[PDB]
Each structure stands twice: as C-alpha cells, then as structure tokens.
Symmetry: C3
Subunit: 341 residues, 3 copies
C-alpha cells in the first residue's frame, strides 16, 4: 500500500526567489524619481509541474511541463497563473534529442538572458535597445522547438519557429524563427545564434527584423569563469527604412570556496537609421555582485549596479519610441535569496 | 512514516492537451483572414486538485475539487487560475447520489458539449447560435447540482439551478435552472434535457429563455458507435418579441483495434423572430477525424473540419448580434495530443 | 526505494470554504437591491504550498510559502493565482523567533480581522470606515515582518514595515509601519497594536494616518469565550485637515460538546473632521451564528446578520468618499462549510 517515485505521474518543482531592491532614479522629474524609486520586494518565486510518460504505442517518451509565473514581482501586483512560464508538451529519443510545442524560450533568447543578462544587465541587454520592429521574442507561446542531442560531447543545436505576439491572438500574421548553436571546447564554449522576425506591425509600418549573436564562455580549473557576447540587430520597415544597432555584454567571475564575485558590463551602442546615427541612443550598465553558496540548493547574494540610458528617439510615426530607458537613468542596490527544489 | 494513498488529503490530477491548429478564414476581408488565420498552438492542458473526507459527525462523504483553467489556449494569452473550471464542494451517499455547490457544468450543457460538440462542432453546436437572450449557461459559478444515482442500471438524472452571469457579480437578478435525464437501454442511451434562463438583460430587454434537447447514443458489439441530437431554443423578450431556433448534431464512429474514425455534422437552422424567418442565419459544420489510442492513458489525433456560418443579424437594439459567425466562415486542419493522470 | 515526509521539499495545504449567502439590500433603489441582493455562492477555497529547508551554511531555518487566492468568491469572477494570499520567504531561530519578507498580514490587521471581524463584522470593522487616507493595510506586498517568540509564556510582538499600495507598483512613495503586542494572562489575552501610514495620495491630498487598537480575549474552563476591541483612527491631510474616527467590536461565545453559539457586534462611530462631527457617518452590524464541530478538521455553520451603514460623506475633493456603505444597508442569512488539510 505505500508510495514510491513511480506512484506519481507528476513532479512539483519550485524556484523560491526574493530580492529586496532599492532604486535611486534620476530621470529629472523629482516626482517620477520617488515613485519608481525606493525599496520594493521582488518575489519571483514560482511553482511548476511536469512528468514523463512512456506511451505503450510510441517509443518516443512523452513530456510535459507547466510552470507558474512570478507570484509578486516588483513593479507588480500579486498573483500569477499556471503556465505563464515554460509550459509545453513534447517527445524525446536519445538519437534525435527533443521537441517541444507551446511556450518556450526562443533559442536566441536563451543566450541573451543567460549568461549575458546576469546580473542586472537585462535592462540594457535583454529588452533594452532602441531598434524598431522586434529584435527577438523571449518566452513565446505558439512555438515548436527542437533541442538536438550533444553531438560527440561538443556540438548542440537549439532550433525553433513560432507565431508572433499578435497572431497567437488572431490579430496578426506575425511569425518568426531562430537557431542557436553551441560548441564545447576544452574549457570553452562557443555560442552563436540567430533570429528572424517577420510581418511585425509597429509605428504604422510592417517590419522584418534580423538579429545575430556570437559569444563565448569559460570555466577554469583555478576558479575563474567568464562570458562575453556581441549581438547585432538589423531591421527593415515596409516603407524602406533600415535600422541597425549592436550591443554587447561581458561577465567576469571569480569563485572560491563558498563564494563567487561577479562584475558585469553591457551596452547597446548608438542606433543607425538609414546610414545616419542617432546621437545618444547608447545605453549601458555596470554591475557588481557577491554571492554566497549557502546550501547545495540555494544562494544568497548582494548586488549593486548602474544603468545609464539613452536620451530618447522617435519611431517612424513622429512619436517617442518606447525603450528600457523611457523611465530614466537609475541605480540599484539589492540583496536576495534563491532556492531550487 | 513511509507514505500511502491515505497519507494525503488531496490528489493532483491533470489533463495535458495540445493541438496545433491551422485555420483558413474566408470572411472576405483578406486582411482579417490572415490575422485569425494561420497556425496556432492550443494548449488546453490544466491541473487540478480534489479529495474526499469522511467527517466523523456526518455520514455523507465530503467532496471537493479545484480545477485550473486552460494554460495557453489559442486566440489567448498565457496563464490561468485555480478554479476557472469545475471547482466545487459537496456530499455523497449511495442511496441519493451527490450534490455539488459552486462552479459546475449545467445539466444541459454537459450533453451539448458531450458527445455532441465533438469534434469541432462547438463553433456551431455549443456557443454558436443566433438566438437572443441566453440559450443556456455552460460552466457556471453559483450553482447547486444534484446527480442522482443510476436507478436500476438504466435511469439517471442531472438536476441543477444557479445564478446568472450578472448576479454572481451583483450586477443583476439573472437566474436559471435545468434538468437532464438518461435512459440506458440495451446498447442505446436516451438523453433528454432542459434549461430555463430568467431575467437575462440584453439588447435593452429582459429575456426569458427556454431550451430543450433530445438525443441518443449507441455503441455496438462490432465497433460502430454513434450519437445524435436535436436542440430547440425559444426566447422571449420583455417587449413581446419571440424568437425560435433549432439545431442538431450527429456523429458516426468506427472503432477498430487502436483506431477510431469519426465524422461529425452539426447545424443551427435559420432563426425565427415573431413568426418571420431571418434568411441566412443557418450555421453548419462538417468535420472528420482519425484518432489513435496511443496508450491506455492517451490519444493522438488528426482532424479536419469546415465551418460555414451565418451571414449576420441585428439584435433588438438595431445593432449586430454577436454570433460564433461574426469573424467569418473558416476551415481547419489540426493534429493534437491528450494525456489523463 | 519508497517515499517518506522527508522525500518532499514542499507541502500542499488547503482551505476548502463555501458559503451560500443570501442578501436583502435596502439601499432605496429597488433595482439596485436585486442586483446586489439574492443568493450567491462564496467559494473561498484555496490552495497553497510551503516548506522549510535547513541550509548547510546558515543555522536559521529557511521558510517559504505560496498561498493561492480565493477561487470563486461572491461578487466575483472565477479563478485565482498563486500568491494572492500570504506569500513569502524568511528565517527562524528559537531565540529570536521569525522574519518574513513579501506579502503578509500587517500586525494591526491580523487583530482587526481576527478575532474581531468574525462573524460578518468585516463590512463594518475591517474595511468599513469613513476616514480619509488609509487607516491601515491588510494583506500587503513588499513587507518585512518580525514575529518575536513567546517571551516567558506571556509576551509576544508582531512588528512590521512595508511599502504602500502605489509604491509596490512604482507609482508612489507610500510607506507604512506597524507593531502589535500580546499579553497572555491566566485565561485572558491583552492585544494592543498600532499602524502608521505615510505619503498616502487620495482626494488630491497627501495623508499621514495613524491607527491604534486595544482589545482583549478570554477563554473559560466552563465553555464561555469572548473578545472585545476599541480601534481609534486619526488622519491628517497635507492641506491641514484632521479626521478622527473610532470603532469597536465585541464577541460573545458559548461552546458546548460539538457546538458553538456566537453573537457579535461592531460599529464605527460618527466621523470627525476638524473638530466638527459628520452626522450619520455611524455604521454598525449585529450578527449571530451557530457552528457545528463536524470533524476534527472542519465546521458547518449557519449565520444571520444585519448591516446598517452610514448615509454617506464627501472626501476632500467635494466628491463622495467610498465607504463599505456606498451600496447600502443589507442583511444576510448564510450557511457554510470549512475544511483544513
């Protein structure tokens, strides 16, 4: 009558995550600075569910997972639903790897975010950017996504296509596709990825976007580790207009006993529209962090960082293009905790 | 202190369900056709919770359940909450069956939807219809519902009443009740059901609605199976106006080893307002489907279907009445998967 | 190979709760009376998750929990998310007690609500009130909160500070802090609590608020129990204006075998603005209830009550201040059930 792991058809998994996070804004509205600014909590804890199933008439193993969103972020109300995060189904054989339908990370985004949005670099390197149309999607519903196996312990591919933000609501024909690749090499790992976005409606124009990324990551027998990337973003409006913007992000780490120190930098460079540059569309961030390996399963950290954002641009409709900078330059000290089970 | 089934006071249950689904619209706006049209995923996976409890001072066994909504449907955003689907409490004795309070299916709806909205027929036979007021509720909050036992292996009753869509928000005095019945007979099963809806506010008129259904269902020793129904809908405005509309839905099936083939048809007939018919308020759908019994616990399927919808009508306020047809005629090929645990 | 309690890193806990609840409104719009009025179900069931963790490098035990909102209340739509209720992380040592970051009850609110909003008294004693600004927060995101241990079996402190309703969305600089205290004494328990609220934006003024509470609670060897409180609320606008309002709430109980009878009363008194009283800003409620201890884990109850609310006031902008009375005087009979696991 007792239970085993085999009694259940699902696993609960969770990621408990809290960050007390103080911000000092410097947008040059003294008022706006206090709203945005100050301390908040940022609970990005969440729960999920997943399981396998060996169907009796299909050798590829069935897989499914349903992850809840963040329960009470900062700048946010409480509560969140099941499947705001990685929710999907799929299959897996050892020979061809796996494929997932639904709501996953794009293969481009998985690198933009990790390792290269950590820590605090997201504002600039993730959704920061001044480019038109859509540089890439991130987590996206309506996606199919192949993850190849590790070919001869070195080479891996992340391939995916899916529907757009609008089209998954039947309010557009926006689509996209993307591919990434990863080459393990001694202590290195080479990352390259791509993602084209088509029929994007924005500023009263249709946009095709293309984004390319190269980067590298190292882990060394002595405790030094690092990551670095260059991202390039093109885009083209249906009225002829071209835009270009490139960025980067870099991270240096020292690890020692139960500790890890981390400096990160990232930046988008001035933006080009039709050969002419747009002065002060630069963004950058510097960041620093101490982290403590408080349990095999958890970490504490303390963190400071500084965003200096762009001084703004119009989109193609003669009206301000929203950027991770429209709220304004801010800095931010935070302590936090994270627990995996 | 190992665990058993008896260690827990709840059960997690899930229904994992994914459907890649391509649509070709033919509304005669070329633009509108692309938005709506195209492929989308349709994750209707969800999770729930439920348990019994034998209260020491009450012989009837306590029952409760909380089912999450669909996590990332088509034409929809991601995420969903606990108790968007069948959420309730109740009790049960073998002599009188069970009763449930909260959010359940109406006894009418349980038949409209099953078997007779499957497969793809829902657009027409479920929420499709041109009639005024409210034909029936479906899943409804604020409901009490009795499910009688199987009297002498043949006769069963589904009985229920509850509050309206408005009244459960304290913005109305809408109410309703409904009853169904089921008679098992050799290889057949006779279904009849009813549902009256009162004080419904709509088109600046209060409406009383009455809807009646008869149908049948057969399973044969040789692998043929089928279902058929006629649904009749009356409604009456508080300004005198009458409306009538009838429908039907039929399903033929062949099953064989691990396979099941399925043709379905359904249709609402032109609508009558005060004796005069409204030409082209007809809707129909034809649908076909192969399904494969991929595990005791799961099925794969492939499916095609064609909706031809009504060409539109006004409500009693001289302004378009919304119908499952306002977006327009479309067809749709889909593959999907479904897993129960 | 089997599982134990120690196999999991989380616990599922739930509170299943249903209340059929009929209301007869008497606002003197005959229409309004029916909308609001009538029966509804009130499912306040919900689910949560929580767990401890003994980090290898930190003696204080890690604690976390994530509680879902109410699944289908009355006057409400269905569904709710994970972490609409008490969601947090924290730590605990026996010497200093515990601390929690996130979304918790304020230390003031925990007493306002319990024991002194039960049963039905909430309308008047919880969010009822006519005072300006914000008397107190209740459940609040972005809060840190210390719960001291029980010092020498008598003395306990609940201390907390957090951000405002706006500021947790970066749309304000509202903050607050609060402290309660509890002295066990023979069969009594003395409660006192406090909560100041700062920079509250409302009626085109900034408000500082201060709210003070004293109360008492008794349990007697013979089956009688009771509670009582007096709550005092000051507030001060940034345009000079002062307001004052005091309230109370009292509860008498007899318990016997498996039964408990309960009379409750509560009331807010007329409100003072700048020394002058606002006639008929009084609110009160009387309530009665029988409850049956149907299982170690659950209760049934039946309940009647009567709210007589204020006849209305303006805020400082010459426009109606919302109160738990704007909808109007109502009474209400209800039966319900509650199950803990």
């Amino acid at each position: 009558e007792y239970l085993t792991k085999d009694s259940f058809s699902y696993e609960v998994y969770g990621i408990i995550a809290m960050q007390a996070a103080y911000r000092d804004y410097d947008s040059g509205d003294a008022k706006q600075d206090d709203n945005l600014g100050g301390m908040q909590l940022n609970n990005e804890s969440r729960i999920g569910f997943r399981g396998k199933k060996q169907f009796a008439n299909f050798e590829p193993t069935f897989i499914w997972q349903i992850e809840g969103g963040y329960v009470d972020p900062s700048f946010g109300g409480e509560g969140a639903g099941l499947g705001e995060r990685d929710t999907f189904v799929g299959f897996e054989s050892a020979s061809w790897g796996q494929v997932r339908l639904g709501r996953v990370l794009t293969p481009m985004y998985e690198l933009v975010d990790w390792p290269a949005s950590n820590p605090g670099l997201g504002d600039v390197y993730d959704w920061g950017g001044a480019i038109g149309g859509a540089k890439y999607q991130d987590r996206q519903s309506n996606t199919i996504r192949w993850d190849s196996p590790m070919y001869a312990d070195k080479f891996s591919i992340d391939a995916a296509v899916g529907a757009g933000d609008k089209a998954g609501l039947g309010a557009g024909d926006d689509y996209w596709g993307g591919i990434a690749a990863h080459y393990k090499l001694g202590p290195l790992q080479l990352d390259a990825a791509y993602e084209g976005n088509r029929n994007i409606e924005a500023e009263g124009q249709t946009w095709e976007n293309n984004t390319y990324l190269v980067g590298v990551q190292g882990w060394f027998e002595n405790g030094i580790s690092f990551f670095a990337q260059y991202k390039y973003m093109e885009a083209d409006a249906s009225n002829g207009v071209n835009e270009k913007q490139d960025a980067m992000s870099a991270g240096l780490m020292y690890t020692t006993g139960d500790w890890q120190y981390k400096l990160g930098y990232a930046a988008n460079f001035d933006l080009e529209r039709d050969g002419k540059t747009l002065s002060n569309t630069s963004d950058d961030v510097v960041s620093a962090q101490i982290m403590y390996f408080v349990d095999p399963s958890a970490v504490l950290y303390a963190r400071a960082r500084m965003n200096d954002f762009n001084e703004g641009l119009d989109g193609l409709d003669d009206a301000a293009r929203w950027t991770s900078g429209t709220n304004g330059d801010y800095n931010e000290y935070s302590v936090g905790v994270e627990y995996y089970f």
